[PDB]
Amino acid sequence: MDKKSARIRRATRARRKLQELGATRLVVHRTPRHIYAQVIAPNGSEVLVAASTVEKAIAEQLKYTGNKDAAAAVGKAVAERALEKGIKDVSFDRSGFQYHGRVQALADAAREAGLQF
Amino acid sequence: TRNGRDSEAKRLGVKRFGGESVLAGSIIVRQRGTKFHAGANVGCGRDHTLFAKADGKVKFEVKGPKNRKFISIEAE
Amino acid sequence: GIREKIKLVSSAGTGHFYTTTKNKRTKPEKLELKKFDPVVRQHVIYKEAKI
Amino acid sequence: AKLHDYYKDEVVKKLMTEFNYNSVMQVPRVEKITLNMGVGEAIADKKLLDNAAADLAAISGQKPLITKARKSVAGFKIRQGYPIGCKVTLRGERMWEFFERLITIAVPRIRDFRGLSAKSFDGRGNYSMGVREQIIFPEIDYDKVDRVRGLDITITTTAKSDEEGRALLAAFDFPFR
Amino acid sequence: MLQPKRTKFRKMHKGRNRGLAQGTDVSFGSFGLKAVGRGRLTARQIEAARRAMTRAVKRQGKIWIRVFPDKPITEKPLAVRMGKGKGNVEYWVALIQPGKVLYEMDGVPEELAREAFKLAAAKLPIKTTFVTKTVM
RNA sequence: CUUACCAACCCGAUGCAAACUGCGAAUACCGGAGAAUGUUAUCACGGGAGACACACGGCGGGUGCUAACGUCCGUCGUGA
RNA sequence: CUCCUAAAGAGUAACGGAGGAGCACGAAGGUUGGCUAAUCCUGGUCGGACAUCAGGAGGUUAGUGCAAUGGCAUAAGCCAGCUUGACUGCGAGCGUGACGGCGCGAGCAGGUGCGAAAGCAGGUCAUAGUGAUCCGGUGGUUCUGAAUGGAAGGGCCAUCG
RNA sequence: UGCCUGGCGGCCGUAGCGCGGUGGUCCCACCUGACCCCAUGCCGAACUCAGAAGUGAAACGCCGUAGCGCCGAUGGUAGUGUGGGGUCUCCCCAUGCGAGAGUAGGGAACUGCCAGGCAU
RNA sequence: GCGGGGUGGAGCAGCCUGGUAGCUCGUCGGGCUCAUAACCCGAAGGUCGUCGGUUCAAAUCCGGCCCCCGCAACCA
Ligand SMILES: [Mg+2]
Ligand SMILES: [Mg+2]
Ligand SMILES: [Mg+2]
Ligand SMILES: [Mg+2]
Ligand SMILES: [Mg+2]
Ligand SMILES: [Mg+2]
Ligand SMILES: [Mg+2]
Ligand SMILES: [Mg+2]
Ligand SMILES: [Mg+2]
Ligand SMILES: [Mg+2]
Ligand SMILES: [Mg+2]
């Protein structure tokens, strides 16, 4: 029983609900070394904005690329990248991860940066 | 021992077939289980009655990895 | 045929009340719930009383 | 972490050549030691099960986990959900500091010692053996003994076969009759 | 007398007996008794025809019975009016369609198999014919 | 220890099912569009009813014995 | 009430074939978070065909307060935390009935619970668990009050037999 | 532009399973540590945090392979609407529709958005 | 066609209200007696008519079938 397939099972219900609501969701993927963030169109097939720690434009200004304060950088970056693009209200898709620690630090940072969710 | 009992028929089944134009709230299908599943603009009642949540034409589709039948409203 | 009918009287001054059932053999403790009182239009606590 | 340190330096490179492994990750490991105490008779009185688990708590320093009946069976006249026995699983160094505590103290204590068996393997590389007496451990004092209940000990290893399984515990000098 | 050891229900609808049969070729032995008519085969008729063939070849070779009386037939007793529920099960039948292979035989010469099948056909209510195993 | 016999599971082959389905028609039914045809043949409201013992025939069935000019439903036709 | 008869929409009879109900539950309801069976094999103190432990096979053959059917992995199954939406007023629009009725329901107002939030909640996987009217009881009530002020009685609302 | 990886989809087995091979700069996975945030009805297994010594063993991805699954004609057959007929419990003819199973065969998915790496 | 019963060897409880087999006799063993009965003392014997379903669990519940006891079998 891989931890991944058990995690997609945890994320399926919320994603179906967001798909039914027709909302533009902020997807978050978390690895032991990196953290990722995507804003998907309501149709679920277009990536509007994206930000992560594998981008050197953000990675160079971090001590370690996979700790809690690194997630706050991606949260701040993905929000201001989306605000100027025109998206203001989204829905946070924790995607099977517990809303705690790094993904929580990513969320409130994006919430602090002016993304309404 | 002895037979001779039965219950009243419940008038289940599809009420609006594919392509029919419906108003918001129209019952589409009455069913015991979810033989049909709610798609876009379609709600599921407490007895799994599928009703239109918006005006338009009803549409039957089979989707998903389990090949389940869905009913949606093409809003028009 | 064991559940007895009871009424839940609002803690507010109004005489409004709900009605429900209760198995007084297994649950001898009085039932207390927060329910909406339509007279004062607030959620007050409702205590059990005889029907 | 005595044998834990003894693991990563000594038993790895003798095993690495013994089976000619390509990567160090192929060598078997020891994940957890789980001690089971099937009381069975606690249905008569449950005052004896808490002190029964009090013993298992002293053997490993962990508060035990009371297991419940998975299903009702009348052959032993229990309904599903009854407290039937306790268990403790040990991981990390608490497993190690216990793993040496028996192999160097748990071995030289059992009455009429004759050595462990080499056939008591699961078939995929995991060992299990049961001790009949609980007064074999230094923790549990002989003075305080209400009963002589034993317990089972199983060894969960990442080994794939019994040959790789027996080879690992043999490296820890396990008594093999 | 062949009969299901147990059944999900005790009584069945009368039904109909349309269509052609499945299992229209000799599959186990070398010779077969194929039904060309349509009708029912009670368990007694099947047993009677089996004994006639079993004794015909003096208990030699192998004999298969390709049919099985799985349909229960009810009857109302005498001096009983209509209604008051379905009758009680009295015997079991196997529905036969044209082309159904009823019995198969092996281990005996053909000339002996024809006489054995001829003796058995005299016990059955449907017209039959002799068939032999063919290369599919 | 080897021994009149019975034999689960599995595998291969063969059937059966109103209350079995990993399949699946013809029809029928619902909706949309389009002509032609039909004395609006359709719906609603109002005045007046009668009728609520049906019969046989065809087809699909239950029941009975695939018995009955039997019995009970579905559907069509005729008698009424 | 459930299945079949019932003829692939609905409906459809018989002293036709089979079974159930006249309840239960303040959690077995709401929500958030998590979880995934049956059976069997192997190894293992007492311990046995069957207890708890470990591993593999298996893939729902399990489970669902209860009959059957239809459902159920996003679980509707299992566990924990916090809780009372088992809310009040309404209700577009449908379903089903000769009728009395019965059923589904987005959304709106007020107030509330859970959640970081999107959201979810007007009882329970769904379909049985029920009884019209009259008469009378109990509580409430900016209704009425046979000259007038009260009261009795009546009405209205909630509820009981 | 090509190769490679990650995320989100479309699609829902021609896409699955097995068997064989193969991949670590990056990515991913395992991994390291755990006082603390947080977590175990016991257990840092899981969840979570702090990290980067090691390893691609497992897992995952990729490549091959017809062992199984899966897909699947053409023709015939069954059934059947309408009309007619017979020896009428069942059939036949005209006409329209036409399976299921099986056979030949197919088949080791396809594809969109974004991101990163690498070559270019 | 409807109701009630089949439990140690014999006659009966228990079933209703699921878990726990009881009573009197007889039988076996030992005593008292010259000996037997009576008597005193101790002990065994049923897996509940059979097959199947419900339950963790069946003498008990719910079937079907083997059986015995009944009552009813009417108007022509
Ligand atoms: Mg009448
Ligand atoms: Mg009439
Ligand atoms: Mg009629
Ligand atoms: Mg007639
Ligand atoms: Mg129908
Ligand atoms: Mg509200
Ligand atoms: Mg809050
Ligand atoms: Mg239910
Ligand atoms: Mg007055
Ligand atoms: Mg870790
Ligand atoms: Mg075909």
8 Å CB contact between A76 and A38: no
Distance, CA of C15 to C1' of G157, in Å: 12
The 8-class DSSP code of residue A116 comes to: B
Closest CA to A117 of A87, A85, A84: A87
Structure tokens at A99: 């809303």
Q: Calculate the angstrom distance between C1' of F19 and CA of B56.
A: 40
3-state secondary structure of A74: helix
CA angle, corner D132, sides to D127 and D135, nearest 5?
Answer: 115
Distance CA A39, CA A113 (A): 15
Contact E23, E103 (CB under 8 A): no
Q: At A43, which helix (H) or strand (E)?
A: none
Name beta bridge partners: B13. B30
**Alpha-carbon gap, residue D88 to D63, rounded angstroms:** 7
Report if CB A13 to strand H is under 7 Å.
no
Give the C-alpha separation, A28 to E32, whole Å: 72
Residues near A85 by beta carbon (within 8 Å), at least 6 away in sequence: A48, A49
- Convert E74-83 to b/e letters by CB count within 10 Å (16 or more is b): eeeeeeeeee
Instruction: Residue D2: count other Cβ atoms within 10 Å of its Cβ.
Output: 13
SS3 sequence of chain D: CHHHHHHHHHHHHHHHHHCCCCCHHHCCCEEEEEEEEECCHHHCCCHHHHHHHHHHHHHHCCCCEEEECCCCEHHHCECCCCEEEEEEEEEHHHHHHHHHHHHCCCCCCCCCCCCECCCCECCCCCEEEEECCCCCCCCCCCCCCCCCCCEEEEEEECCCCHHHHHHHHHHCCCCEC
Report the protein residue whose CA lies nearest the C1' of nucleotide H49: A101
The C-alpha atoms of residue E108 and residue E56 are separated, in whole angstroms, by: 11
- Identify the structural domains of chain E with CATH numbers, from first to last: 21-136 (3.90.1170.10)
**Boundaries of domain holding D66:** 1-177
- B13-75 folds as OB fold (Dihydrolipoamide Acetyltransferase, E2P) (2.40.50)
Q: Which residue has the tokens 């529920």?
A: E85
What letter represents residue D14's amino acid?
Answer: K
**Numbers of helices and strands, H then E, in chain B:** 0, 8
Quoted resolution (Å): 2.1
Length reported for chain D? 177
Tokens read off for D3: 């044998």
- CA–C1' gap, E126 and F10, in angstroms: 39
Q: What's the domain count of chain D?
A: 1
Phi, psi of B58 (to 5 degrees): -75, 155
Compute the half-sphere exposure of residue A67: CA atoms within 13 Å on the CB side of its CA: 5
User: Could you tell me the residue range of the domain that residue A71 belongs to?
Assistant: 1-117
Residue nearest to nucleotide G43 (CA to C1'): D122
Give whole-number Cα distances, C5 to B28, C19, C35, in Å.
39, 7, 18
Q: What total number of domains does chain A contain?
A: 1
Tell me the Cα Rg of chain C.
Answer: 11
* Calpha distance C15→E18 (Å, rounded): 75
Please tell me the experimental approach by which this structure was elucidated.
Answer: cryo-EM
Q: Are D101 and D35 in contact (CB under 8 A)?
A: no
The nucleotides of chain H lying under 7 Å from a protein CB are: 6-13, 26-32, 34, 37-38, 41-52, 54-57, 59-60, 78-79, 89-91, 112-117
Rounded to whole angstroms, the Cα distance separating E108 from E60 reads 7
